[PDB]
Design a protein around this nucleic acid. Structure first.
Ligand SMILES: Nc1nc2c(ncn2[C@H]2C[C@H](O)[C@@H](COP(=O)(O)NP(=O)(O)OP(=O)(O)O)O2)c(=O)[nH]1
Ligand SMILES: [Mg+2]
Ligand SMILES: [Mg+2]
Length: 756
DNA sequence: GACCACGGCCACA
DNA sequence: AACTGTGGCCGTGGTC
């Protein structure tokens, strides 16, 4: 099973290393035969005689075109003659590419910026994370001495905890009487002992929580301050820090550094992404949090240290369990994209799509288009229409059926051969013309994107089929995650065509797809209304809710089945309407905001404040109980009493402030914020206090009784002292709970004043 | 002060 | 955060 790949430089030549695990043994395959290259397009063949002659310089050394080779590839679906230019070292390409492009005899160059090891993975047709081989994992966490105001990593590391299949252990340089703590003399000895533990256990995976942006950099600063070689890598190297956009990432050669934080943030949506909250969400059992002030006082005074040891041990244990749960799942992403687990765990969706498309293009000998330059990026700053959405018939309805298409946009792409290589293709005999926008697509030869999307949807349907017969529930989870991957990947492949910095960009294709979707959905609505007597309550982009005004549930279901058979006979290609749920009742507030109740009593809420993180828990809970009173038995009076009781509880300062916290995320650097909201104000005060604040952190604040501007009277919830603090009950009454319940209870004649 | 455009956040498909 | 478009909704400023 291929773990990863890189390359070293041996006597000026590239040597690919393939790190793998075969028969329970870690092996390193070496390859000195892979030659770096990129493609060039000339207007005349004989011009190559001069193309071989352009040289450049790297670090005093001269860089020359090693060898050239004429090759036939497929650009925009059409055969074309390109020149493969080979080089000695990959680092030659960034230094000579421009000099090649400046030449008048060349039109353009292609596939010049792809990294060497990943190009080796693609060209050799290798897929990592493949096989039944089980890896050994080791999770670890650290405890730090934090005073507010210091710089990063000034204080030493107090405890280093690790965990695996054998249990959890803490290492510390102060005496704690516990069966899982190992006491050493100094911090240096503790770090060295952790290194010895890693070297002896030799895990294939090192599991951390946000180790990409804290634990590893902290250990690096301390290791250099005390003169320790942080030789965690299986080849004796130390963690390599790399850029990951605005954040950082940490590699450990020969191993896989699995940082859970981006995986969890990208997989599950939570109000906060603390280790305690993530663990309680994934496993249901709570985890006690010990804050930095407690451990700082416990270290400086030497008391209550067993509590900090417990916190560190539990940290290591829960990160190990989360790694065990999430790693086999991300291995499926690694197999799907064809890149290393380390890469796919941290890479954005767009880069995942680009790697998948690059691998597919290599498989079909399709010359990959280049990323746009600045002027071309400027041209692509266009605007096209999106999906159709109607103003909902606001209010409460009964006996509702939701009908929606199966993978609307990919099915459109497949059915009409929507692809950049098929758009306005001269000379074909069968065309498909998009509504409104009028773009034509040839259907003689299947397009690149339609082919990939068809394979993907076929695989997803096979996975959903096997899920029904799946016995082993761990496998059920596996195939569920895999089909979710395929779904996200297909939707992102559609979105790729309308992305400015995308290689296979095609605004015409994307707007054609969305016009098709609008046409098909409005057609289905018109047909279900005019010919089956339905009334469409609400309709988003790929489906709608409908009902027979005044009819039995069975009648609505039967007529919906009829309409499905009819409209699916009328629908072409891969386009199919599906019955995806009957609901006893449903309250629709506005576009993207509704709630439905089915037959067994399960409430599905969409868009409402109950599902939003930036709303207070008291408001969410009040709206939830109100919606339950509405949807379970239609007890409007019960809901009005709920809101009156909750507002009286708020007025008398009787509600716990924990239910009063608003969580909002900062998305940019505080310098670049033009409008400063309450969370912005709290973040700016925190940064003024010398607290690390970066794009990604979540500010959790409470509004206090005070002077106007909410941001002036809002403080982080950790600084809330009930003795000297009183939350603004009027704020959370008149502007959190009441507005949340009013948009619902107005449909029964209640104004805000009938609720306080 | 009443009112209103609008960064800014998160959600839905 | 780092494929897209559509939408609701708030806290705040600034101009009448
Ligand atoms: N660029 C982009 N477009 C999207 C996304 N989600 C939806 N679209 C658009 C394009 C999609 O064609 C359309 C439908 O989205 P689904 O509700 O996901 N339909 P499906 O049948 O795949 O879900 P299921 O199989 O679970 O029932 O929404 C997204 O995340 N990104
Ligand atoms: Mg569907
Ligand atoms: Mg849907």
């Amino acid at each position: 099973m291929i773990l990863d790949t890189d390359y070293i430089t041996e006597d000026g030549k590239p040597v690919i290393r393939i790190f793998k695990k075969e028969n329970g043994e870690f092996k390193i395959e070496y390859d000195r035969t892979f030659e770096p290259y990129f493609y060039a397009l000339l207007k005349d063949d004989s011009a190559i005689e001069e193309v071989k002659k352009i040289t450049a310089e790297r670090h005093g050394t001269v860089v020359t075109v090693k060898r050239v080779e004429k090759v036939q590839k497929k650009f925009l679906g059409r055969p074309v003659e390109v020149w493969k230019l080979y080089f000695t070292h990959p680092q030659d390409q960034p230094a000579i590419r421009d000099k090649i492009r400046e030449h008048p005899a060349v039109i353009d160059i292609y596939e010049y910026d792809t990294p060497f090891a990943k190009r080796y993975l693609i060209d050799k047709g290798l897929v990592p994370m493949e096989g039944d081989e089980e890896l050994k994992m080791l999770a670890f966490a650290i405890a730090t001495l934090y005073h507010e105001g210091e710089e990063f990593a000034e204080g030493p590391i107090l405890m280093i905890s690790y965990a695996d299949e054998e249990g959890a252990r803490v290492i510390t340089w102060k005496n704690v009487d516990l069966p899982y703590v190992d006491v050493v003399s100094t911090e240096r000895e503790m770090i060295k002992r952790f290194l010895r533990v890693v070297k002896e256990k030799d895990p294939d995976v090192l599991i951390t929580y946000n180790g990409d942006n804290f634990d590893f950099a902290y250990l690096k600063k301390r290791c250099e301050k005390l003169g320790i070689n942080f030789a965690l890598g299986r080849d004796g190297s130390e963690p390599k820090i790399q850029r990951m956009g605005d954040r950082f990432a940490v590699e450990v050669k020969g191993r896989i550094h699995f940082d859970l934080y981006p995986v969890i943030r990208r997989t599950i949506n939570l109000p906060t992404y603390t280790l305690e909250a993530v663990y309680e969400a994934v496993f249901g059992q709570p985890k006690e949090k010990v804050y930095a002030e407690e451990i700082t006082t416990a270290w400086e005074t030497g008391e209550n240290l067993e509590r900090v040891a417990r916190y560190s041990m539990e940290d290591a244990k829960v990160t190990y369990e989360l790694g065990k749960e999430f790693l086999p799942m991300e291995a499926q992403l690694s197999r799907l994209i064809g890149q290393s687990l380390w890469d796919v765990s941290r890479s954005s969706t767009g880069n995942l799509v680009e790697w998948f498309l690059l691998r597919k293009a290599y498989e079909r000998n399709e010359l990959a288009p280049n990323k746009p330059d600045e002027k071309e990026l400027a041209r692509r700053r266009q605007k096209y229409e999106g999906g159709y959405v109607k103003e909902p018939e606001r209010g409460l309805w009964e006996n509702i059926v939701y009908l929606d298409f199966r993978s609307l946009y990919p099915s459109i792409i497949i059915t009409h051969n929507v692809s950049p290589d098929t758009l306005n293709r001269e000379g074909c005999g069968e065309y498909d013309v998009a509504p409104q926008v009028g773009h034509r697509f040839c259907k003689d030869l299947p397009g690149f994107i339609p082919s990939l999307l068809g394979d993907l949807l076929e695989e997803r349907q096979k996975i959903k089929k096997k899920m029904k017969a799946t016995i082993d529930p761990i496998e059920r989870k596996l195939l569920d995650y895999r089909q979710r991957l395929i779904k996200i990947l297909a939707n992102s492949v559609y979105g790729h065509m309308g992305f400015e910095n995308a290689r296979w960009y095609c605004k015409e294709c994307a707007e054609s797809v969305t016009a098709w979707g609008r046409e098909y959905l409005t057609m289905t609505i018109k047909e279900i209304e005019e010919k089956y007597g339905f009334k469409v309550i609400y309709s988003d982009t790929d489906g709608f809710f409908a009902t027979i005004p005044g009819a039995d549930a069975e009648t609505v279901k039967k007529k919906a089945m009829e309409f499905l058979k009819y409209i699916n006979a009328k629908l072409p290609g891969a386009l199919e309407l599906e019955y995806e749920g009957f609901y006893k009742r449903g309250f629709f507030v506005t576009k993207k905001k509704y709630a439905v109740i089915d037959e067994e009593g399960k409430i599905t809420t969409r868009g409402l404040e109950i599902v939003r993180r930036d709303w207070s828990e008291i408001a969410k809970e009040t709206q939830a109980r109100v919606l339950e009173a509405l949807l379970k038995d239609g007890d409007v009076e019960k809901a009005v009493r709920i809101v009156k009781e909750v507002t009286e509880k708020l007025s008398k300062y009787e509600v716990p402030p924990e239910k009063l916290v608003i969580h909002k995320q900062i998305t940019r650097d505080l310098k670049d914020y033009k409008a400063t909201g309450p969370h912005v104000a709290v973040a700016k005060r925190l940064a003024a206090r010398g607290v690390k604040i970066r794009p990604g952190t979540v500010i959790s604040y409470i509004v206090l009784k005070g002077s106007g501007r909410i941001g002036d009277r809002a403080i982080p919830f950790d600084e809330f002292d009930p003795t000297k603090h009183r939350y603004d009950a009027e704020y959370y009454i008149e502007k959190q709970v009441l507005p949340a319940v009013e948009r619902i209870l107005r449909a029964f004649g209640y104004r805000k004043e009938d609720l306080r």
